[PDB]
Design an enzyme around this catalytic site. Sequence first.
Site: not given
Ligand SMILES: [Mg+2]
Ligand code: NA
Lengths: 210, 1015
Positions: B193, B408, B410, B453, B529, B596
């Site tokens: 991400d 990852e 995801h 993920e 997280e 974030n």
């Molecule tokens: Mg992800």
């Molecule tokens: Na994000």
Amino acid sequence: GHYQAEAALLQCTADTLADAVLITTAHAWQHQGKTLFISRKTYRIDGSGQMAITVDVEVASDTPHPARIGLNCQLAQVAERVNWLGLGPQENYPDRLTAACFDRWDLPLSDMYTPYVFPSENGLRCGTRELNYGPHQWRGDFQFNISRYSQQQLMETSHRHLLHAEEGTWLNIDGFHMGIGGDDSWSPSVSAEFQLSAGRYHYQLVWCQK
Amino acid sequence: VVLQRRDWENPGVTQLNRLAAHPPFASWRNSEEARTDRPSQQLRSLNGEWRFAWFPAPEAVPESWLECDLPEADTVVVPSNWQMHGYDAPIYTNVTYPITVNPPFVPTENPTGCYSLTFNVDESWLQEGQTRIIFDGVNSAFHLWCNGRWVGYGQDSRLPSEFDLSAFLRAGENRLAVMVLRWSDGSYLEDQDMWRMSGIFRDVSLLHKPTTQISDFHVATRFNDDFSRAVLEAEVQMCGELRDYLRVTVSLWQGETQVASGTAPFGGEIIDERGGYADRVTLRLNVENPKLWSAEIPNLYRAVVELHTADGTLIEAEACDVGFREVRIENGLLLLNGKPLLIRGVNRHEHHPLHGQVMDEQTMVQDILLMKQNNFNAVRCSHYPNHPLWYTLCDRYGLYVVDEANIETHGMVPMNRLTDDPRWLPAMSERVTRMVQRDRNHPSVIIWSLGNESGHGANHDALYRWIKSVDPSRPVQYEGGGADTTATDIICPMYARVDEDQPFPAVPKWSIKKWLSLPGETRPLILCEYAHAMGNSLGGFAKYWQAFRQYPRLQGGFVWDWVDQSLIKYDENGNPWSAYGGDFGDTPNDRQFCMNGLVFADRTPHPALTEAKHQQQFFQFRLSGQTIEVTSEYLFRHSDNELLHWMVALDGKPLASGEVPLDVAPQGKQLIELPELPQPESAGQLWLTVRVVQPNATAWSEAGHISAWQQWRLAENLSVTLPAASHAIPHLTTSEMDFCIELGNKRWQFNRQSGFLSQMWIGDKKQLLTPLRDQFTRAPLDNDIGVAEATRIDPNAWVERWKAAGHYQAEAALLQCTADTLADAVLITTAHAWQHQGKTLFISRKTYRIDGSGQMAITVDVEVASDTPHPARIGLNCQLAQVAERVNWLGLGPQENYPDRLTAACFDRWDLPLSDMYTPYVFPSENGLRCGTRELNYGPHQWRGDFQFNISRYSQQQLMETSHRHLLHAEEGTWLNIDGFHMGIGGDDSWSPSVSAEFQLSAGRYHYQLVWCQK
Ligand SMILES: [Mg+2]
Ligand code: NA
Ligand SMILES: [Mg+2]
Ligand code: NA
Ligand code: NA
Ligand code: NA
């Protein structure tokens, strides 16, 4: 000095409105120089004969959180039934009210007293929007108990059989009431969310003849 | 063969002719240079100006480019991402792959970066030995040519690729050609991400090793029960021809003092029926009373590995920093050097707003300094191996590191489609194995992670066991498939809440307290997280830290995350502004979900950072009478650079202060007796504030640094004094449309049609631009919006419930507006209902009492329909006509604070410029609130009571209508929002309702009171 605090009048004024009379009061409760609580009220009496009471209380942050924040009086009336819209039918307190249901309840006066063998504060009903007794009606969002025994007599009498019905009816109406606790009975057990620690409290009541 | 084979669409080919992975090498030919870690002549940087040409596909690259430069190509700096030079667009997508999901295939239009360089190679480098090229990071795949001839191929964007150029180079001028593919089969394992970019984004270098060479080495440190004795064990591998005269010497240094040394010929112990490793040797050095490495005290030794002849000719030396520490899990607790860690962690991506995913020493150091200054002790490399220097800096400054493999997946459906497929085990295995081979000697790395993920597949189980087999010194964690699978030593959920269960099918997130005690569960729990810091967030942060301190087996977590992934763009006037997803033509995209961070992309702190700093403090405090109890949460160090300052103030006015040096043993307590404080005469609340100050500079902080603080209420003296009775009486004037009240040079106007104070005059100058009106809404926070993907609309999100209920478009309907003249006052009474399509949402009943002293006392009583979604706020707002320079308040501050994020704020008298009262979140929202305020001052106005407020040049309406902070324009005057009550901001995650029940405005009836006057 919560049990011996003396009220000192700060302010007591009257105003005429178009359709009502407004009384404004302010009191300080003090023990040996220290102000424990301040109560500021307005009483608004209109043409319908309703008395609207607003109460705003300051509690000193360094005084132990108080057991209740309310009003009391001894009514002349002794009536047979007590009718309320609120939590019941049985005695219930802020930390012991999950069993109680919101509905219209109607009980004989004696059922509004819990005969604990060691007498104490008893018979409170919470979340009450309307209370009826004889000619009187109180509306708002309050906790109440109603009985022939004053808090003073309950705290001075060691056994239930030694209690005597006082003249008229003692009414305690609380905007707020402390939890009862009980995780044990030999140390402070009232959880923080049920202690009256907010510092400033507001409640309002309408008193009328029904 | 190259265009015909298409190795970038084959998960079975991840490299061609690539050399074995290894720890950092410099091939020193002098031992002193190895020891001091000075530059090596055998390691040359190829960073600088290269030649670059962009192509829509590899098939479009002209075969001429191999042997000769293209004059149509440009001169660009390397390392770089080519999206940052403008060649194509960076794409921001969260979960959904940026390419069609058709493994192993990528789009035929596969953007292609043609890099090339022309450089000198000295003669001495080709006469004797081996010359290799090292590409520290190439995103995402590449073919390599040297002087027109094909060298090799490599995948995995986040680990070094190395090739022998010995047989390819000539003396003097040479040419490198690198064809970098944006997409490959490796992209299927690179669905993090973050911004999707490409290019040679990490260092390029040339390394000269002798033929007879150190090809690998591993450093281990083991300890006795009390860590008073250590054995350093170093396994060393060689390449080249074995000879009886060859030796390895490993020497260990503490500054300029050599502490231990071992020398041995090659030839390991017997391993099996066929013998042992003739090309390996293990050295064992005894160290008495080793200085132990931790984040608290990052003690380091220097290990020098000398390959030499028996009589002492050095052939080459390699070296590394050694931190003596033991990491183990025992009885459900993660221990460092025998003590249970409390992880004050953060996830950190490699992001720069100007340079993309290119990292520099300055940004890395800036990040480490800010982290340690804000009481962080740990970092998770989300979600890939980092630039090699990061680990060196974490070794030296002292941070615990979770080193995570570049895996990852995801976007797969289900998430484990590739990770449970044995066909993808080879590609996966290299992303794990080559990370361990690279980073295993860094003391800062305390935990390995298998990726992020990617669900839970059998490949995870295999690689878990591989690491456990190869490196017993570090726990292995992995969150995929429910955070407590067979592939993890640590229960490591993401965004599991403290008290609230989230019982998702197959992969529930249990309350962290409950997770620990599930039947048969014994492991430690550390969130990989938590506390998603998207925009106005970190609400409920204190709840986590309370739980971490109470429960032994709750050992902390890593905040998501460190730094906003916003990129700089320029407007028509060449002025810079921060951009998020979609701002580059990139589609599909996930908008602001790339931001974030605790800090802005330029490393300016969000308000949330101070809350983290406060909750992550290493000193805890209790007050009892005049006694302050200070408890240390250091595991290893004494408080030898700390003093406690204390101050008592009466409603902001200092009365007494002092200081006491702290002398607390790790985990110890210190009692501090406050001197007798004289009674104040006047009314008000006494406040005690304590601060821990560091008198001396450190490697990570300046002299006078504040590391911890705490506040208590002391004695309160409630005011019983009656305000002086004034001899003036306000005068009421009535018209059809207005009630007006006059007193001296002051005038108030109540519009009888609207029922609000529409205007107020001081010396016949108007004070309001917009009437004073109730407000029940806020410009929604990212947490209110509740979106992780721009395609997903959630009817359960706060903003959606408010919108569906008509909160944002409910209009005031007047029920009552009356005026009464009293003895020394005018009393205005109003009542309003807000309704939406027949339903009454709110009722507001007010009195305004204007007395002879000029004060207007406002009493507000609000009813909120029990079946309407709980409102964001209950207060008033108006647009003042005045713009003043300063805002002065008695309340919580100085920084922005909300009901579920105010622990860091202190009660005191604060004075800031107006601009500081606005938080420049890149996605604009409600911001700048300050809670627990008793008095607010702005120009000639003073408001008193017990309220939350914000104050700025931007209305809630403009804030909620504007998508970027740079598009905001100062409105005429100043918007004031004064709240009796305000809903929490939440943040446990940012894609579901996360405001805890105790912070929702659910009481049904609300009361507040304000006094407005002029000072
Ligand atoms: Mg992800
Ligand atoms: Na994000
Ligand atoms: Mg491939
Ligand atoms: Na008693
Ligand atoms: Na713990
Ligand atoms: Na907005």
